[PDB]
């Protein structure tokens, strides 16, 4: 059985803190604890460990990332800007 | 002995060849 | 303390010429669980350590007591 | 000649470790 209707991981907090803040926390707590793909392995084995630090268990690599996710949306749009500006300079 | 030993080496430089 | 198995190695330690005193020891024990037998233990006082030799047979034990040097001090029980 | 070999060195920039040079200009008196 799916045990709770809506609270999810946030059911640990229980009655406290109000429904809106618990929904804010539910969004990011699902991201941080979830596993992610290691780019270098090709394995779903990239756990979080401290804010902004993302340890592959496979390969023993560690990658810098966002606090609650591996690649935040601002970081991706930076990376494409750097790809764009490089090939202008080369030719 | 060493002068006779040298001419063996200097022979083996020219004769043996290869990589 | 340091056990020795070999009989040749024990005779070298007696002639080593730091060994001032030895001591012999006799113990009653029961083999398997069938009958009693008279064990012996030839211990020798080295400077660092105490070397010892466990002989089970009584016949080999009595020849070993004679096979010690006379100049070495020997002490029974 | 046979056993002798030329190995160079490439002091250059990032490659290699810089040799001893006169630094009389730069010494703290």
């Amino acid at each position: 059985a799916k045990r709770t209707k809506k609270v999810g991981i946030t059911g640990k907090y229980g009655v406290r803190y109000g429904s809106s803040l618990r929904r804010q926390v539910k969004k990011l707590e699902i991201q941080q604890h979830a596993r992610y793909d290691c780019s270098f392995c090709g394995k779903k084995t990239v756990k979080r460990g401290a804010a902004g630090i993302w340890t592959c268990s496979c390969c023993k690599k560690t990658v810098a990332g966002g606090a609650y996710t591996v690649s935040t949306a601002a970081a991706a749009t930076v990376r494409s800007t750097i790809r764009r500006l490089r090939e202008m300079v080369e030719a | 002995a060493l002068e006779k030993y040298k001419e063996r080496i200097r022979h083996l430089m020219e004769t043996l060849d290869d990589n | 303390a340091r056990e020795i198995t070999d009989i040749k190695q024990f005779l070298e330690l007696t002639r080593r010429a730091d060994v001032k005193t030895a001591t012999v020891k006799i113990n009653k024990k029961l083999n398997k669980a069938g009958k009693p037998f008279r064990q012996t233990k030839f211990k020798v006082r080295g400077s660092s350590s105490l070397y010892t030799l466990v002989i089970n047979d009584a016949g080999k034990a009595k020849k070993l007591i004679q096979s010690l040097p006379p100049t070495l001090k020997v002490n029974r029980l | 000649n046979p056993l002798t070999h030329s190995t160079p060195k490439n002091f250059g920039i990032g490659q290699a470790v810089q040799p001893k040079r006169n630094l009389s200009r730069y010494v703290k008196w």
């Binding site: 780019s39 270098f40 392995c41 090709g42 | - | - | -």
Partner: protein, 97 residues
């Protein structure tokens, strides 16, 4: 396309999967073509180039990781490198891939 060529070789032609089994076929001189993934590490890749160029075997680089190279050959486990021992009915090797 490259997926249509490899879909033939699996169903009618000799092949082998993974690193250790390929290097044996490079050593023995059975491999005609090898297919290396993108996401494989560079010491692994640069070793397979060196084994290949001694044996004079053609080397294709699959644009795509090791998961979707597994999908191309049609296996549910991921595969880093694939070698072709014998060609199928389709031509594979003679084309530029």
């Amino acid at each position: 396309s490259i997926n249509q060529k490899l879909a033939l070789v699996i169903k009618s032609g000799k092949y082998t999967l993974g690193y250790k089994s390929t290097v044996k076929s490079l050593r023995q001189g059975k491999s005609k073509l090898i297919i290396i993934a993108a996401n494989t590490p560079v010491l692994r890749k640069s070793e397979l180039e060196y084994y290949a160029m001694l044996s004079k075997t053609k080397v294709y680089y699959f644009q795509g990781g090791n998961n979707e190279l597994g999908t191309a050959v049609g296996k549910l486990f991921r595969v880093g490198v694939v070698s072709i021992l014998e060609a199928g009915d389709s031509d594979i090797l003679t084309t530029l891939a």
